[PDB]
Amino acid sequence: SGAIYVGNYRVVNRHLATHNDWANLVWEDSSRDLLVSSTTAQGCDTIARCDCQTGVYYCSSRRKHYPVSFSKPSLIFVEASEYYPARYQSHLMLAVGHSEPGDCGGILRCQHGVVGIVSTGGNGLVGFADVRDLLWLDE
């Protein structure tokens, strides 16, 4: 679990969105595993606007943060799970690191701010849904 709070928005993994998230829906994209809902309180997370390929992510299954090198956002085949059939997920970045299903939502940050959230894993890899292209989160 985990979310990004920026301005009047909350960014979560689409497969983990709650009833309140869907009732206050702003935007969702199944192909990216992202959902954005509106909030009443103001968020203070800073979103990175960059092409960094190094950062640190929070891994809840180890209660630790790990530094990683990660790929640029791309269309990657993602194996079937209980939330989606086998499909290509877009805007996904992979790194070598530990991830279990409950780790979805952990934030990946670079020196510029929030880069994305854990969205996939398995085989010693961890995948992050990018949010750096969502320029409207700031306005």
Ligand SMILES: NC(=O)[C@H]1CCN(C(=O)Cc2cc(C(F)(F)F)ccc2Cl)C1
């Ligand atoms: N973005 C997606 O399609 C998500 C939906 C839920 N997803 C998962 O559970 C995949 C997953 C599997 C494992 C493994 F290998 F241990 F079984 C570890 C971590 C993750 Cl996130 C993908």
Ligand SMILES: [Zn+2]
């Ligand atoms: Zn950066």
